[PDB]
Amino acid sequence: ADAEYDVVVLGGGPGGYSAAFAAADEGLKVAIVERYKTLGGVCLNVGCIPSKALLHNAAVIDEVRHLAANGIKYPEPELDIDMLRAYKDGVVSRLTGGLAGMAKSRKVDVIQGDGQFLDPHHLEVSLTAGDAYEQAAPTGEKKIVAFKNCIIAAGSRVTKLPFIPEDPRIIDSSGALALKEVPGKLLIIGGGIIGLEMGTVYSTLGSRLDVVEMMDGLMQGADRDLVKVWQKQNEYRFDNIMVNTKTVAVEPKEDGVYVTFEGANAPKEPQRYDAVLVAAGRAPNGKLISAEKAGVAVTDRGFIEVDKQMRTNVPHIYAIGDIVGQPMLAHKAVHEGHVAAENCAGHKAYFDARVIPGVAYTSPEVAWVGETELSAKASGRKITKANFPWAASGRAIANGCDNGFTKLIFDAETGRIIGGGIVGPNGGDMIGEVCLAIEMGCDAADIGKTIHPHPTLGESIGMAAEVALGVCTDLPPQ
Amino acid sequence: ADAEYDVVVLGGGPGGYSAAFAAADEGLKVAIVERYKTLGGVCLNVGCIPSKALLHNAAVIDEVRHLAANGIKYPEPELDIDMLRAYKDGVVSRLTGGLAGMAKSRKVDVIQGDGQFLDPHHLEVSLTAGDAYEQAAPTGEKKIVAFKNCIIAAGSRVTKLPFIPEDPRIIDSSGALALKEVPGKLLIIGGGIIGLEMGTVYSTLGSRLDVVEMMDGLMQGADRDLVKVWQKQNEYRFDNIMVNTKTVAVEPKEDGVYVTFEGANAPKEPQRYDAVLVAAGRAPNGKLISAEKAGVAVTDRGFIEVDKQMRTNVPHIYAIGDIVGQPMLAHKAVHEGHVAAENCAGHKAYFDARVIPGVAYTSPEVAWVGETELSAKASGRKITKANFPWAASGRAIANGCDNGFTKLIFDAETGRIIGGGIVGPNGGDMIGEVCLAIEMGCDAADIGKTIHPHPTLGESIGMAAEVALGVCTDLPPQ
Numbered sequence: 001a002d003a004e005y006d007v008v009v010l011g012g013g014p015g016g017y018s019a020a021f022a023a024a025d026e027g028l029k030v031a032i033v034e035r036y037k038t039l040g041g042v043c044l045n046v047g048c049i050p051s052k053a054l055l056h057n058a059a060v061i062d063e064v065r066h067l068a069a070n071g072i073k074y075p076e077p078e079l080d081i082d083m084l085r086a087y088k089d090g091v092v093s094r095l096t097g098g099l100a101g102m103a104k105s106r107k108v109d110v111i112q113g114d115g116q117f118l119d120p121h122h123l124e125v126s127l128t129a130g131d132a133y134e135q136a137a138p139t140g141e142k143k144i145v146a147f148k149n150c151i152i153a154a155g156s157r158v159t160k161l162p163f164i165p166e167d168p169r170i171i172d173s174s175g176a177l178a179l180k181e182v183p184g185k186l187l188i189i190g191g192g193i194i195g196l197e198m199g200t201v202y203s204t205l206g207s208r209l210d211v212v213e214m215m216d217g218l219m220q221g222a223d224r225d226l227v228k229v230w231q232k233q234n235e236y237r238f239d240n241i242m243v244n245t246k247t248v249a250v251e252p253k254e255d256g257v258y259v260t261f262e263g264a265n266a267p268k269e270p271q272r273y274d275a276v277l278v279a280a281g282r283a284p285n286g287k288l289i290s291a292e293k294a295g296v297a298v299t300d301r302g303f304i305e306v307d308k309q310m311r312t313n314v315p316h317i318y319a320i321g322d323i324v325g326q327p328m329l330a331h332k333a334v335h336e337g338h339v340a341a342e343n344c345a346g347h348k349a350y351f352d353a354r355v356i357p358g359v360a361y362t363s364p365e366v367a368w369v370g371e372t373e374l375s376a377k378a379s380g381r382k383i384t385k386a387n388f389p390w391a392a393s394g395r396a397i398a399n400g401c402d403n404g405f406t407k408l409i410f411d412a413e414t415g416r417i418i419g420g421g422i423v424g425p426n427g428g429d430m431i432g433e434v435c436l437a438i439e440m441g442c443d444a445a446d447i448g449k450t451i452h453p454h455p456t457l458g459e460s461i462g463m464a465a466e467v468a469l470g471v472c473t474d475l476p477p478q
Numbered sequence: 479a480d481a482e483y484d485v486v487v488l489g490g491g492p493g494g495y496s497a498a499f500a501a502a503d504e505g506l507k508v509a510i511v512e513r514y515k516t517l518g519g520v521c522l523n524v525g526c527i528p529s530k531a532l533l534h535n536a537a538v539i540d541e542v543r544h545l546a547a548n549g550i551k552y553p554e555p556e557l558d559i560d561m562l563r564a565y566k567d568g569v570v571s572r573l574t575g576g577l578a579g580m581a582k583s584r585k586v587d588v589i590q591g592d593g594q595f596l597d598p599h600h601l602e603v604s605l606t607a608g609d610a611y612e613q614a615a616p617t618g619e620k621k622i623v624a625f626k627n628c629i630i631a632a633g634s635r636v637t638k639l640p641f642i643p644e645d646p647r648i649i650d651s652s653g654a655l656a657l658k659e660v661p662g663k664l665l666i667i668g669g670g671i672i673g674l675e676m677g678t679v680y681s682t683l684g685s686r687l688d689v690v691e692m693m694d695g696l697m698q699g700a701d702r703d704l705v706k707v708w709q710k711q712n713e714y715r716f717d718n719i720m721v722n723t724k725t726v727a728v729e730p731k732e733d734g735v736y737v738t739f740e741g742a743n744a745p746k747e748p749q750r751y752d753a754v755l756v757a758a759g760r761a762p763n764g765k766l767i768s769a770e771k772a773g774v775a776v777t778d779r780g781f782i783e784v785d786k787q788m789r790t791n792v793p794h795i796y797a798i799g800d801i802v803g804q805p806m807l808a809h810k811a812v813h814e815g816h817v818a819a820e821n822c823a824g825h826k827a828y829f830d831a832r833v834i835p836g837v838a839y840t841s842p843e844v845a846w847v848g849e850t851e852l853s854a855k856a857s858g859r860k861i862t863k864a865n866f867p868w869a870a871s872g873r874a875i876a877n878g879c880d881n882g883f884t885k886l887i888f889d890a891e892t893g894r895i896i897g898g899g900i901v902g903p904n905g906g907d908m909i910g911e912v913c914l915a916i917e918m919g920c921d922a923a924d925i926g927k928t929i930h931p932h933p934t935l936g937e938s939i940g941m942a943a944e945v946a947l948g949v950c951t952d953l954p955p956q
């Protein structure tokens with residue numbers, strides 16, 4: 001009754017704003033409903049971009065220490081946390097500003113409010129106010145927005161653990177990115193990538209680390225051999241790496257937060273920390289938007305299941321990004337958003353989920369895509385693997401990262417590449433070649449005969465394929 | 479009469495030792511004739527590996543300066559040239575040692591001597607002695623080696639300019655890599671990649687630079703738009719960038735080498751330098767091995783022309799690497815060596831030269847492959863280009879390299895990708911995806927639908943393809 005659109009996008013994250021801009025490029029009249037002032041969602045405001053910005057600066061600090069043995073001597077740096085925090089916020093504010101300008105240029109209306117479904121064709125938007133991301137309150141004003149199509153892109157939120165009380169020293173990923181102080185002793189609860197990245201940053205800045213994980217290893221889903229290389233190089237940062245251990249008590253006290261662990265190789269006495277980072281996963285927000293009032297089905301865990309066109313059970317309502325399933329990754333959200341937008345424009349478009357890369361921007365990076373040794377064993381798929389160790393790379397040796405490696409995985413029956421993994425610097429920038437090779441159905445001969453430049457880390461992809469064919473001359477005979 | 483082999487390889491560079499190891503893996507009895515003690519040729523001993531090692535360390539020094547605005551403050555480094563030189567030599571000696579061990583393991587005989595053809599099936603090897611690369615002398619002993627097949631891999635040498643006299647301050651790329659001192663004022667004669675890389679290293683270490691080039695721009699063969707970005711970021715290193723100017727006089731004097739230039743925007747007074755680096759190209763060594771005594775045809779410029787099996791006009795003698803043609807690149811030499819070795823083993827193998835990448839490991843890097851805008855205009859080939867500016871990349875902005883870009887070139891009639899260029903860090907590690915995409919015949923839809931990880935520099939390849947399809951939502955509508 002207050003406004004009508006071809007497409008209303010609920011949430012302005014990588015999924016939502018990509019969907020909205022794509023729909024507008026197709027000539028549709030679009031609106032984004034986003035409860036906070038800035039676009040870009042979790043990835044831009046409190047996720048990928050600020051975390052990788054801190055990680056990049058931290059990695060140079062680490063490189064500088066290794067420069068002295070090469071005759072380039074620097075002291076320890078003087079660290080100004082206030083200027084480091086402003087540098088990271090300055091990257092985000094440059095990007096959020098650009099996104100707003102791009103919305104206005106594409107004539108996409110941006111509404112600041114909390115959206116809730118009224119019926120299959122209307123959102124009720126409780127308008128919000130506040131400029132800072134994650135800090136907006138309802139004004140009390142309400143606006144009803146009618147749509148032909150809705151694209152649900154309401155993302156995820158930090159998973160909470162019930163047994164952990166509230167205390168300013170107990171933080172989540174957003175608290176970590178706020179960079180209030182460098183704690184002397186930092187506990188990471190949860191072994192996943194997001195907490196390990198934050199630990200890397202704080203470790204380089206001066207924090208001692210512990211980490212606890214109920215499951216059997218860190219970075220669940222990554223092949224163990226990549227994680228083993230990451231762990232060996234990072235062991236010096238940690239006083240306790242505790243896997244298969246339960247966290248039973250978090251007790252804040254005057255001089256620290258005291259945490260108790262039950263594990264076969266975990267200490268028994270409670271451990272004091274200056275800060276505790278809860279990074280135990282993220283939960284989708286499907287149950288929080290009144291979707292049933294639109295007829296949209298939502299699972300018990302809060303996911304909104306979609307078909308390959310990104311359609312919910314309600315044919316004119318789509319859903320994309322973290323809220324439809326794993327993996328919760330920004331580049332998935334973007335592509336899914338393109339697919340949903342083109343279907344809103346009447347162009348039959350489908351989303352292929354087989355090749356979605358994952359990257360830990362730790363030091364070293366851990367990048368992988370497609371079939372893993374873990375999944376192949378779980379499904380029974382017969383595979384062959386080819387591994388090129390960076391101990392054989394003049395580039396890696398010169399650069400001081402000769403402990404990395406590049407691994408390719410092929411289907412045993414067909415010979416096609418179906419997966420790949422890289423541990424070592426720039427893995428994230430190199431895994432795209434593996435993604436493309438899987439998409440194209442390459443075999444080992446396709447990749448090995450492709451002439452990669454020397455001396456690079458990227459040529460390890462071609463040489464690993466040469467390993468698969470038995471004709472790598474930079475390694476012993478195979 | 480002194481020894482007989484299935485395959486004798488003349489020269490032990492990237493081509494030669496790769497050919498020899500591949501032939502031995504095929505079960506042939508092989509020997510390498512190499513006048514110096516170490517294997518790996520120019521690339522390992524006085525080329526790729528030591529230059530990129532110095533470039534890498536220099537790039538960290540440059541990064542450290544930009545860290546202060548982000549609250550990470552370091553002073554200028556204390557530079558120990560002796561320890562820097564030993565670090566670079568230590569990388570090479572680790573690699574040369576490994577190559578020797580790999581030769582002995584593969585049962586490939588290594589002969590230290592200067593090889594000259596005696597007749598179509600014999601080499602006469604004037605044995606040499608000396609441990610340092612480029613510093614060996616004949617002992618006077620001679621050895622005659624008989625072969626079924628010979629693979630010529632005798633590489634190239636520094637091009638000399640006749641009008642330049644001898645003086646310890648007038649150096650070539652090997653002199654530059656020796657790192658005797660940091661000159662106050664360094665003149666680079668020649669605008670090609672090798673001299674610009676050395677200039678980058680010395681500039682960061684403290685040298686002022688001038689550069690002179692008879693031709694119309696620096697880095698001939700690279701598309702001008704990539705070089706323009708490199709130049710803008712490097713202008714501060716140079717006092718004079720002189721293109722279209724002739725070098726008419728090099729006059730050594732007590733207090734410096736005085737050089738006179740004739741150019742439309744070059745100074746007229748002679749300029750004093752502490753050091754002059756002659757980097758005016760490299761010449762192939764085909765005229766220097768007595769090839770005509772084997773029946774092998776050699777061009778006037780010293781190239782040995784081969785067919786796609788790497789065969790000379792003499793069917794049982796092959797030739798690979800710098801000595802058969804441009805581009806003079808190590809990864810070309812390696813692949814050509816594999817092709818020659820497999821044909822020596824009776825397996826028909828062909829070498830495809832269409833996709834050979836070139837990389838300047840300058841700061842920023844300049845990586846390109848395949849069709850360029852320059853070549854397309856020279857041949858008349860109709861093309862379309864798609865350019866993704868790194869000003870739109872959150873990764874590049876966070877990292878401080880948002881001036882780079884990724885450019886893809888497609889055939890206008892067929893739509894297939896036929897070329898690509900990247901300027902900015904890690905281009906060398908990313909161009910391999912472009913190489914593979916050209917090899918596989920990808921179009922823009924193949925590359926754009928491939929899901930690249932966010933936030934990376936590598937996803938610029940996928941987004942440039944999205945630009946080509948008109949559906950990039952991180953840029954204004956196209």
Ligand SMILES: Cc1cc2nc3c(=O)[nH]c(=O)nc-3n(C[C@H](O)[C@H](O)[C@H](O)COP(=O)(O)OP(=O)(O)OC[C@H]3O[C@@H](n4cnc5c(N)ncnc54)[C@H](O)[C@@H]3O)c2cc1C
Nearest residue numbers: 011013014015035041042043047115155321322328329330
């Ligand atoms: C610390 C951290 C690091 C990460 N690092 C990476 C990485 O390196 N690479 C990577 O690919 N991914 C990374 N991620 C994950 C990435 O942020 C998410 O996968 C991505 O942001 C999801 O995109 P989305 O559009 O589905 O959801 P979101 O980014 O979560 O956007 C959803 C939006 O909807 C809004 N919203 C929610 N409910 C409502 C409502 N009812 N009304 C109105 N608006 C609403 C929210 O305010 C939010 O802006 C990281 C995440 C974190 C927290």
Ligand SMILES: Cc1cc2nc3c(=O)[nH]c(=O)nc-3n(C[C@H](O)[C@H](O)[C@H](O)COP(=O)(O)OP(=O)(O)OC[C@H]3O[C@@H](n4cnc5c(N)ncnc54)[C@H](O)[C@@H]3O)c2cc1C
Nearest residue numbers: 489491492493513519520521525593633799800806807808
């Ligand atoms: C400063 C510099 C930087 C470079 N950077 C790069 C780069 O980053 N990337 C890249 O791909 N390329 C680079 N190159 C080029 C690269 O070094 C060459 O393309 C490559 O080494 C050629 O391999 P090759 O086997 O054909 O010849 P070579 O490496 O030249 O090996 C030929 C060998 O034959 C031996 N020989 C010659 N004549 C005789 C004889 N009559 N008897 C016995 N032995 C003999 C020589 O001693 C030599 O070891 C660079 C070169 C230089 C100088």
